[PDB]
Amino acid sequence: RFASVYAWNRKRISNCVADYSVLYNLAPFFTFKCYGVSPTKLNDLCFTNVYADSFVIRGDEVRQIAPGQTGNIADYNYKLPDDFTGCVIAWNSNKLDSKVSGNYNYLYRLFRKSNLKPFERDISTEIYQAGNKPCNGVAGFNCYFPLRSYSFRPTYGVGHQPYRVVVLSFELLHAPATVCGPKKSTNLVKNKCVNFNFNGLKGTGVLTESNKKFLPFQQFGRDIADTTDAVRDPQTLEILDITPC
Amino acid sequence: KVSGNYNYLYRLFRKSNLKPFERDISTEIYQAGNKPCNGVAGFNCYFPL
């Protein structure tokens, strides 16, 4: 169940680890174009807040959600900002959304007095005053509903298949971040010279097994000269003293 | 160009960085995922231009 294009539902996700590898294995996922960052480097950025919009659009107007574009359904119901950050995920769904008897569960607006700002959830069922004189009450001459409904049939080919599209836009370092991707954990070498990056500690020196008694939240190890001489290895409670050979 | 000049290109995908003043000229097919996407671009395989 997804919301309509104009009545799009926004779900906010924060304070977790965002893994895109378990999401990239989707079968009908073909539409993918990211602008802010390279898609391969999505796992090494920390995000203040993440919200997603889910809505169903026709097969012909799939790319109308792309930033900087205009159209009948992309100018009156939902649109992306020109400086759109991130990228959307779209996949064809002609086995569930499409109905044999015709799917009429969504509405699209084609009539409007003016345009709407991108990232707007404001919509109404106000009639379109097409005629010069004011139109109120019931429909008369030049008085029509600004919105029209989908007409989805399985006999339709490309250009009419419904697409389930999720839009992943987010802020970039506007606050203490909440969502970060998975971080690289490249093995561990002991009793041998190695460069290390243990949670932001940079240096050189062989890593040896040590048995000092730390405390529940004691990570670093500081010596007399105020230099690191012990580190608590991430993903483990092990403590290793850093000394040359 | 008003109609659009699509003769100027740039790269976005490379396996690793490059030394100063280094060229690349040519563009091989890039495989991004573990599975070898031989042939043409698509799933986990793209055109780096």
Add this chain to the structure above:
Amino acid sequence: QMQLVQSGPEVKKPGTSVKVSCKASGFTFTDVSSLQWVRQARGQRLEWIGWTVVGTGNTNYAPRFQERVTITTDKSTSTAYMELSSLRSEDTAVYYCAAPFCSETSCSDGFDLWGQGTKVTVS
């Protein structure tokens, strides 16, 4: 110019199906403009066959015009295919398709354009 083109007079027989097409040069059916059809006899009172909207798909017809007459709107060609069935001897008249110039900008509360129609006679 703002003109409407249509086929010439036609002669037919009862018990068949008639398809009438009229185009507009310099005018388009767009999304807001809605056209209508009238039948004009030999100096007799007009009758409203029906009006349809190309975009919204609104269908309205006269009470006696809901079983033998149909209007199908084509946006690509901006035309109104008029389908008539079980035609009788009272259909010998001139059919007109009329639409006002209302294309996303402005329009009045009346019908502006008027084609020459088709002089259709059924024996």
Add this chain to the structure above:
Amino acid sequence: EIVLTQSPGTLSLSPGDRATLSCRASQSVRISYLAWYQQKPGQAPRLLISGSSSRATGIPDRFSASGSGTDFTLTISRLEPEDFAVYYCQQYANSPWTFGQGTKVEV
């Protein structure tokens, strides 16, 4: 299901004279959805006044629409030689139009 009454049915006036017509509808009263049309004998019809408040392109200044009640009045400044056609007044808000017999002006 609309009954339209137009008066006078026939006009016998000298050419170039001012003329007045009135009409009424048996359906619900609408003040902004009345239009006046003219159809030539053997030629395509042309609109005269749309909405009873303004004219269209090419409409002469003679045609003027007025009326506060159900009756709508159309005034013509002078009996222009090529304006001698048959008049019709039509509503828009009510049921599908049942066009009246038609008021035709002639010498």
Add this chain to the structure above:
Amino acid sequence: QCVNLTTRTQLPPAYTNSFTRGVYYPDKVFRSSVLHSTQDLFLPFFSNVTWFHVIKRFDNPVLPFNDGVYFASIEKSNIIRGWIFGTTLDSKTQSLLIVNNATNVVIKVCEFQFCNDPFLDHKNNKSWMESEFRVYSSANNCTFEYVSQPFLMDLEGKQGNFKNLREFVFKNIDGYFKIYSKHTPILVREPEDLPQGFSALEPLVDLPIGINITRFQTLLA
């Protein structure tokens, strides 16, 4: 909802000394059998303290907050059920609220509509519940709400042989606020004051509210 209980039976102040309380770990990273000189903000040793009581008797006066403050209190049932921290506290600016009333800890940064004499514990005749859940009616815009899982808490009201003693202390650095709390059990010291001794502490919470706070008022019932 609240009731204008009033009837303030105020008593003259008494004296107290903060002997050696409130030494915490600035950054606990394995210094072993050494002497280290650090620079932070703390309680100056032997800092003076003004004393008041509540026993019938009930005092909930108003005291301004000023750039890092120690407060202390003695019970066995956590009778006091709230602490406001703001700058005007008249339903016009966001104010911090720390509650440890029944079972769980509550922190909220919102423009509360504080009652004149708010309470949460009044119920006939000696047993109490969480009646009058909210002492505020104004909530225009506030996001900093959290519900912290129970710490070592108290059950049932006990009078005599005091065994629970809570001290709070308030650090503020240009928006970065920090709260240090010691809820000390097993203290056999009934009559007068805080125990004399030493005990390592840990900052209960660091928090960037970034708001202006200069006043408060005690909420016990």
